[PDB]
Amino acid sequence: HMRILSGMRPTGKLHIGHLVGALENWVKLQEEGNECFYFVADWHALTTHYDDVSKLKEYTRDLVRGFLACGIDPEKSVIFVQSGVKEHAELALLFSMIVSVSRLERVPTYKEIDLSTAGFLIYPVLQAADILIYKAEGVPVGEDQVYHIELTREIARRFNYLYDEVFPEPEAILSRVPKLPGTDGRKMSKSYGNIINLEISEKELEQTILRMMTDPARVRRSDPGNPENCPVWKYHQAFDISEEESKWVWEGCTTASIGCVDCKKLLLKNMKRKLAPIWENFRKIDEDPHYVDDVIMEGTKKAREVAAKTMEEVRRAMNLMF
Amino acid sequence: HMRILSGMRPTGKLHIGHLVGALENWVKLQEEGNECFYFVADWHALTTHYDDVSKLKEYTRDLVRGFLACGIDPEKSVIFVQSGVKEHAELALLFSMIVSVSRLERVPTYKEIDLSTAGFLIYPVLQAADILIYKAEGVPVGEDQVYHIELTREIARRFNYLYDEVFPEPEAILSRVPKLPGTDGRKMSKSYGNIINLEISEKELEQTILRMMTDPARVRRSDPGNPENCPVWKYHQAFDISEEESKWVWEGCTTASIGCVDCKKLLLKNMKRKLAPIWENFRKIDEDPHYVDDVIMEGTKKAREVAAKTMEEVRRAMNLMF
Ligand SMILES: N[C@@H](Cc1c[nH]c2ccccc12)C(=O)O
Ligand SMILES: N[C@@H](Cc1c[nH]c2ccccc12)C(=O)O
Ligand code: SF4
Ligand code: SF4
């Protein structure tokens, strides 16, 4: 029974990849009954997108609207916006005084990802503030983000040592969910036009699935394919294909006894099954205008009072006046 | 008629050097009737002294007590503590997103002054926040600190350009006051035991002045000296030696017709003249316990409301939700 913390940067409309990776895990942690703190990391959006803020406020709200459509329940999780919890800035600043420049340079997520800014360098320090300010015990993350969890633990340890013992050492909760490719085999990116937004229509989903990439081995209908080399098959898994349906595809495809059209019809049925409730939810949320604003203010108010309680300790430990 | 901003790090009891350099200029700017914002930079104390915070809160208060004893009047200046104005942390963080790592590395005050920390690198960004958050027009500084004013102007310009025009470009107000050496010729440092605290007693001042270094040329009483090579002479200037008294010293010393004892008796009279009111003031302040706490809360409350007004603009310009 745990204190979970996680966040997402508002960079746009949420797609299939945010859902089957991150958000489903978030909802699973929520339903298992842990104390979940989930937020829109709007200040992290600035570390990389300080050149285009024209849609930041708007994307921030949309991200919260999306969390909600996907099952993030504010009656049981704390949902908030990073920029509203001013205490994160203060802790980030305070932690920056105990972390070396070289240590931030070693971060792989750094040198791998304009971005020559002080802000991008201390990104992980801010991320440590986000996690440690709610004294989180678990942080759901994909293998890619593990290095930021290790630093946070170091920060916690160096802090507890130099001052007083205030912070638990948080641990990563790794996703088993495999990364989903784009609708055309390659990685998901907006520039490749291979993305599927959660808020797509049935006609547009129907058309995106039908022109989707299949195993290039199947030049003709009579040519058998190999689902391991097929994006459609990868999508079948993300959308809860039954043991029966998967034997049908596998034996169908490999024996060249089903056509990809039929195979995609099955993905459509299953992916529409997962999306229909999310689509309904987007409609229910919009009919109560202010529902999302109310959720944001209430949620951020709650995150704030937890954060403030932690800062009282932090300031007392560092012997600061205020 | 201007908006003046400046601060000092609480590193200890204030001495002669804080008074005749920085504080006298502060009081002069105050008396000329400018809008002065003066504060204890307790977070900057952490950039260098994160290893010894045991006396931080205590030194912070003492620094404010000292500002007051020296004539910083809260009925006309805004006196506050940096850590109490949380908005500084937020602006610092926001400015860090628009300043390069290399630009912070170029800062001479950096590579010239443990200190391998992220916090020490972004020190000037925090200092830009301190200055630009009150939209200051003038910042009193010694030649040494000029480079931090130039960066702040760059930050302001890059911000106004990328977002909306929120900040004036502040300018440095350079001290004419020459640096005062220690009581033994060399630079002032606590490790050389050549410092004179403002809160010294008459007996201790009397004794510190009498054993003070004189021109080594005066081996004997009959040997003339050269006041330009004498620390006592340098102190005479900081303590408002009259044209008459200075002709007496100069002709006395160079003609070997006065003795250093007599010369120091004159420094004593004059330095005691400047210190007696400050000493009385320390007594008047202490008889009203809470006077300093009241001043700190009232002052910081006032700095906060100005700072918050500036942040509303900053957040609106960067299109952040909160
Ligand atoms: N940009 C970060 C956002 C973030 C900040 N703090 C976090 C804590 C946990 C997870 C994510 C975060 C990310 O995508 O990971
Ligand atoms: N350490 C800085 C303190 C400071 C922060 N902001 C400032 C603005 C003006 C003057 C001083 C400051 C200094 O001594 O200069
Ligand atoms: S039958 Fe299905 S798994 Fe096989 S290549 Fe076609 S779309 Fe892909
Ligand atoms: S007479 Fe005065 S100025 Fe000359 S060496 Fe002595 S103390 Fe110094």
Numbering used by the authors:
A (entry chain A), B (entry chain A): 0 to 112, 120 to 328
What text does the study give?
Tryptophanyl-tRNA synthetase (TrpRS; EC 6.1.1.2) belongs to the class I AARSs and, as its name implies, catalyzes the activation of tryptophan by ATP and the subsequent transfer of the tryptophanyl moiety onto the cognate tRNA. Class I AARSs are mostly monomeric and contain a classic Rossmann nucleotide-fold catalytic domain and two highly conserved sequence motifs ‘HIGH’ and ‘KMSKS’ that are critical for their function. Typically, this enzyme, which is an obligate dimer, binds ATP and l-tryptophan in one subunit, while the tRNA anticodon region is recognized by the TAB domain from the other subunit. Here, we report a novel TrpRS from Thermotoga maritima that contains a [4Fe–4S] cluster bound to the tRNA anticodon-binding domain and an l-tryptophan located in the active site.
The final model contains one TmTrpRS molecule (residues 0–328), one iron–sulfur cluster [4Fe–4S], one tryptophan and 56 water molecules in the asymmetric unit. The N-terminal catalytic domain adopts a canonical Rossmann nucleotide-binding fold (residues 1–181 and 296–328) with a central, five-stranded, parallel β-sheet (β1–β5; the strand order is 32145) and a tRNA anticodon-binding domain that adopts an all-helical fold (residues 187–294). The TAB domain is composed of four α-helices (α11–α14) and two 310 helices (η3 and η4) that are packed as a bundle. Remarkably, the structure of TmTrpRS differs from other TrpRS by the presence of an iron–sulfur cluster [4Fe–4S] in the C-terminal TAB domain. In addition, an l-tryptophan molecule is bound in the active site, which was not expected since tryptophan was not added to any of the reagents used in crystallization or purification. In the TmTrpRS structure, which is similar to the ‘open’ conformation of BsTrpRS, the KMSKS motif is further from the ATP site and is not poised to bind ATP. Accordingly, no ATP molecule was observed in the crystal. Although a single molecule is present in the asymmetric unit, crystal-packing analysis identified a crystallographic dimer that is likely to represent the biologically relevant dimer. In the case of the [4Fe–4S] cluster in TmTrpRS, we believe that it plays a role in the recognition of specifically modified tRNA; however, the biological implications of this are unknown at present.
